[PDB]
Amino acid sequence: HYVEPKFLNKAFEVALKVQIIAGFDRGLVKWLRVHGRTLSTVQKKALYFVNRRYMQTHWANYMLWINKKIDALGRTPVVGDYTRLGAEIGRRIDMAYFYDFLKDKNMIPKYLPYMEEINRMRPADVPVKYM
Numbered sequence: 265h266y267v268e269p270k271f272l273n274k275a276f277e278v279a280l281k282v283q284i285i286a287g288f289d290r291g292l293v294k295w296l297r298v299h300g301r302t303l304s305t306v307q308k309k310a311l312y313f314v315n316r317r318y319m320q321t322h323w324a325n326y327m328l329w330i331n332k333k334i335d336a337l338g339r340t341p342v343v344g345d346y347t348r349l350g351a352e353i354g355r356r357i358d359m360a361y362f363y364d365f366l367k368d369k370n371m372i373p374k375y376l377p378y379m380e381e382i383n384r385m386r387p388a389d390v391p392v393k394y395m
Contacts, residue, residue: 271394272327278388279343280330280350281319285387287354288315295360299367306375311363313379314372316390318359324395326353 270277292311300308319326330349334341366372373379382390 275343276341276346277392279346280326281390281392282387283347283350284319284326284354285315285390287351288319288357288359290354291357291359292363295363299363303367303372307372309383310373310375310379311366313375313383314362314366315359316382316385318357318362320390320392323392327395 272280289312292315296303296308296311303311330346333349334345337345
């Protein structure tokens with residue numbers, strides 16, 4: 265039986281998703297220490313979902329950047345290279361600027377069943393589609 269190759273080794277994909285969501289969530293905890301008392305429980309959960317959805321809709325873009333960086337290492341890539349690239353994305357995107365917008369423009373998403381399903385997943389299992 266033939267094996268379909270993955271477009272990115274699963275250990276590498278996991279290293280990336282874990283670091284990007286941990287970085288996005290860290291910035292959200294810092295913002296919620298200021299604003300958490302003015303938001304309901306389901307609004308707070310919807311903002312953790314926004315983090316996961318932001319990674320999913322920008323995944324093809326991040327892969328363009330990641331591959332440019334990996335194709336340039338001049339040695340074979342190890343999972344630590346993806347852990348370091350993923351931590352860089354997770355740190356650099358200043359998501360608090362987007363949380364301020366959603367709160368101030370009253371656009372936090374209404375919390376829906378699908379959002380809770382995404383939120384309950386391990387960062388490692390959040391589904392991404394390739395480009």
